[PDB]
């Protein structure tokens, strides 16, 4: 078991620690992940120094663990982020978000004429790393978009 590396050090017994989250994104995760909904000890660091990574955000939730698809959803929101499963203090499961094949529910098809809007169905797109950015195709209208344009709910 260790303490930390950067200036401010922390320590939790069991839970998840999302580190290396890009600036101005951490708070976005608290929202669209309803992480704040829990009643477990939570710790957030916004605009913390990452050394050569400029600044980062960092979240800590006591006795809580994220669904793979949130790291799968994390792949589109913070690919450089690092989700660490912590137990009896200090890691035991340090993973890195992998680009998925598909995303469900959380996304909204930018195509305004997509039946997915008007009707009671859960969204679903297919993830495909293209030139340099990510592209995702709708399960319904079959249109493909830059994950940059889709991230506008």
């Amino acid at each position: 078991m260790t303490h930390d590396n950067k200036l401010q050090v922390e320590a939790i017994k069991r839970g998840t620690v999302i580190d290396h989250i890009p600036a101005q994104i951490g708070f976005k995760l608290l929202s669209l992940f309803k992480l704040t909904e829990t009643d477990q000890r939570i710790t957030i660091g916004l605009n913390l120094p990452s050394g050569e990574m400029g600044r980062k955000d960092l979240i800590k939730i006591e006795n809580t663990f994220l669904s793979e698809d949130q790291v799968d959803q994390l792949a589109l929101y913070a690919p450089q982020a690092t989700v660490n499963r912590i137990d009896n203090y200090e890691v035991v499961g340090k993973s890195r978000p992998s680009l998925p094949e598909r995303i469900d529910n959380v996304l909204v098809c930018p195509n305004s004429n997509c039946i997915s809007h008007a009707e009671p169905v859960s969204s679903s797109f297919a993830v495909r790393k293209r030139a340099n950015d990510i592209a995702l195709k709708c399960k319904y209208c079959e249109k493909e978009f830059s994950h940059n344009v889709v991230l506008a709910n």
């Binding site: 004429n113 009707e119 195709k137 399960k139 319904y140 209208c141």
Partner: protein, 310 residues
């Protein structure tokens, strides 16, 4: 059971060259050997939430030629979804407890796909969903091309008009790209260009395609000249500068055309194809439309009959 038995027909992108060929071989047989009682005791639902002349009527006629009964509506204004505020989902949920198959055309993209999620064991056939897919269009287009050319490989195909909102060319391009050595010529206004997800598909397959702003540029090498109508009903006002057909085909533009070339058009046509073209040996859109009968008879039989032997 044949490969298409009980399968949904939502998008060409979900079918293989073998499936397409199966449909075409059946169509060829039914056209030469009519089976008036092939779907006796079957009741198919024809549901159009969007205007139609060829697709609906040919589909319904195809059902009767096979001996099935038809039930449905060509307008949703008097369905409970039009007057009582019912979801499309619920509409599909109840209708699927009455019929053996559902043929449907809808204004929003993805309606055919969403329907399959509520029809249980009832197959759904996509007569056109928004500006996305038009599978049966492609099936008949292919049947026509194959009849007039004798092949679906190594063809020189030009698609003119509104390639963006054209569900017809979206499905056709994907289909022909399942075959070998076809070259595509795209002639369309900048604002209505062939979508990028089709081009990326062409690149991935290593198929040749190129942009041209003139028909005369490709008239000499094309085997199929597929004209299309500006999807006025789908255009966003910021694109109302494109409503009028940019490319208009006159009989006089067919002088350098290959003798075997055929001018196809999903129809209806507005001004993109002058009537003087109808008299030439190249005009083939009407014979094409007629092939919709054989193509759709074929699909309906393959999806509703476990085995077909004629």
């Amino acid at each position: 059971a044949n490969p298409l038995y009980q399968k949904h027909i939502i998008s060409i992108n979900d079918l293989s060259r073998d499936d397409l060929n199966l449909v075409l071989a059946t169509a060829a047989k039914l056209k030469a050997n009519p089976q008036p009682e092939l779907l006796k005791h079957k009741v198919i639902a024809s549901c159009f939430f969007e205007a139609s002349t060829r697709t609906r009527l040919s589909f319904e006629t195809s059902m009767h030629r096979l001996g099935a009964s038809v039930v449905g509506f060509s307008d949703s204004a008097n369905t409970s979804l039009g007057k009582k505020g019912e979801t499309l989902a619920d509409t599909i949920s109840v209708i699927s407890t009455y019929v053996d198959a559902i043929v449907m055309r809808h204004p929003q993209e993805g309606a055919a796909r969403l329907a399959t999620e509520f029809s249980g064991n009832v197959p759904v056939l996509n007569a056109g969903d928004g500006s996305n897919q038009h599978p049966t269009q492609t099936l008949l287009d292919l049947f026509t091309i194959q009849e007039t050319q004798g092949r679906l490989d190594n063809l020189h195909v030009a698609m003119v008009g509104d390639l963006k909102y054209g569900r017809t060319v979206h499905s056709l391009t994907q289909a022909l790209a399942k075959f070998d050595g076809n070259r595509f010529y795209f002639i369309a206004p900048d604002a209505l260009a062939m979508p990028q997800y089709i081009l990326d598909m062409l690149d991935e397959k290593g198929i040749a395609w190129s942009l041209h702003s003139s028909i005369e540029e490709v008239m000499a090498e094309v085997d199929i000249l597929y004209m299309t109508r500006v999807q006025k009903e789908r255009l966003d006002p910021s694109e109302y500068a494109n409503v009028k057909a940019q490319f208009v085909l006159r009989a006089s533009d067919l002088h350098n055309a290959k003798a075997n070339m055929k001018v196809l058009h999903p129809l209806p046509r507005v001004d993109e194809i002058a009537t003087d073209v109808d008299k030439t040996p190249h005009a083939w859109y009407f014979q094409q439309a007629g092939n919709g009968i054989f193509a759709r008879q074929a699909l309906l039989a393959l999806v509703l009959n476990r085995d077909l032997v004629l």
